[PDB]
Design a protein around this ligand. Structure first.
Ligand SMILES: NC(=O)c1ccc[n+]([C@@H]2O[C@H](COP(=O)([O-])OP(=O)(O)OC[C@H]3O[C@@H](n4cnc5c(N)ncnc54)[C@H](OP(=O)(O)O)[C@@H]3O)[C@@H](O)[C@H]2O)c1
Ligand SMILES: CN(Cc1cnc2nc(N)nc(N)c2n1)c1ccc(C(=O)N[C@@H](CCC(=O)O)C(=O)O)cc1
Ligand SMILES: [Ca+2]
Ligand SMILES: [Ca+2]
Length: 159
C-alpha cells in the first residue's frame, strides 16, 4: 500500500522557500519511526532540502531530468517510483506538495502532524475530500522546552 506522511501548519501550509518553518523534534522522531525500513518517495525539491540520503530507507527521487547522485534511486514517473519501491508492505511518500498531489489518489493512509503554527507558506498540502477518510489514531501534545508549538499526530485510513 501507499501512505503519505506530512506535517501541516495552519491552512495546510507545508513549506516556505524550500524549508519547513518550525522546529519540532517530536515530529522528526515520529517521521523516523514511521518511515524507517520502508522505501520513501520524494520530489527533487524535497531531496535538495535534505541533500543526504535518509538512512535505513530506500530513497527514491522523482525528477524529469537525469539523476545527479548515485546514493539514491532516480525515477521519471509515478508508476516508475512505485515499481522501484518493489514488493513491500508499505511505501512512504514524504513530499513535497506536487508529489503529495500526485500520490494522494493512490494512497490508503495519511500520517499527518497538525502543527499549531501560523506560518506564511508558499506550498500547501493538497485539499483532500474529508468524506474519503476515517481517523484511526489521534494524539495531541502541548508545546514544551524542545517543541515550540503544540501539535497532534493523526493517521487517516481510506474508507
Ligand atoms: N512534511 C512536510 O511538511 C514536507 C515534506 C517535504 C517537503 N516539504 C516542503 O515542500 C516544498 C517542496 O514542494 P514542491 O512541490 O515545490 O516540490 P516537490 O514535490 O518536492 O518536487 C517537485 C519536483 O519533483 C519532480 N516530480 C514531481 N512529479 C514528477 C513526475 N510525475 N515525474 C517526474 N518528476 C516529477 C520534478 O522535478 P524536476 O523539476 O527535476 O523534473 C518536480 O519539479 C518545500 O517547501 C519543502 O520544505 C514539506
Ligand atoms: C526537511 N525534511 C523533510 C521532512 C521533515 N519533517 C517531516 N515531518 C512529517 N511529519 N512528514 C514529512 N514528510 C516530513 N518531511 C527532513 C529533514 C531532516 C530529516 C532528518 O534528518 N530525519 C532523520 C532524523 C534524525 C535527526 O534527528 O537528525 C531521520 O532519520 O528520519 C528528515 C526530513
Ligand atoms: Ca503556536
Ligand atoms: Ca467539503
Amino acid at each position: 500500500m501507499i501512505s503519505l506522511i506530512a506535517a501541516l501548519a495552519v491552512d495546510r501550509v507545508i513549506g516556505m522557500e524550500n524549508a519547513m518553518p518550525w522546529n519540532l523534534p517530536a515530529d522528526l522522531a515520529w517521521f523516523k519511526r514511521n518511515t524507517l525500513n520502508k522505501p520513501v518517495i520524494m520530489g527533487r525539491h524535497c531531496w535538495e532540502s535534505i541533500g543526504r540520503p535518509l538512512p535505513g530507507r530506500k530513497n527514491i527521487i522523482l525528477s524529469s531530468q537525469p539523476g545527479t547522485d548515485d546514493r539514491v534511486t532516480w525515477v521519471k514517473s509515478v508508476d516508475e517510483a512505485i515499481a522501484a519501491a518493489g514488493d513491500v508492505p508499505e511505501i512512504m511518500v514524504i513530499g513535497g506538495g506536487r508529489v503529495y498531489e500526485q500520490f494522494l489518489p493512490k494512497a490508503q493512509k495519511l500520517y499527518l502532524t497538525h502543527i499549531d503554527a501560523e506560518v506564511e507558506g508558499d506550498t500547501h498540502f493538497p485539499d483532500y475530500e474529508p468524506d474519503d477518510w476515517e481517523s484511526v489514531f489521534s494524539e495531541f501534545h502541548d508545546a514544551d522546552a524542545q517543541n515550540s508549538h503544540s501539535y497532534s499526530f493523526e493517521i487517516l485510513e481510506r474508507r
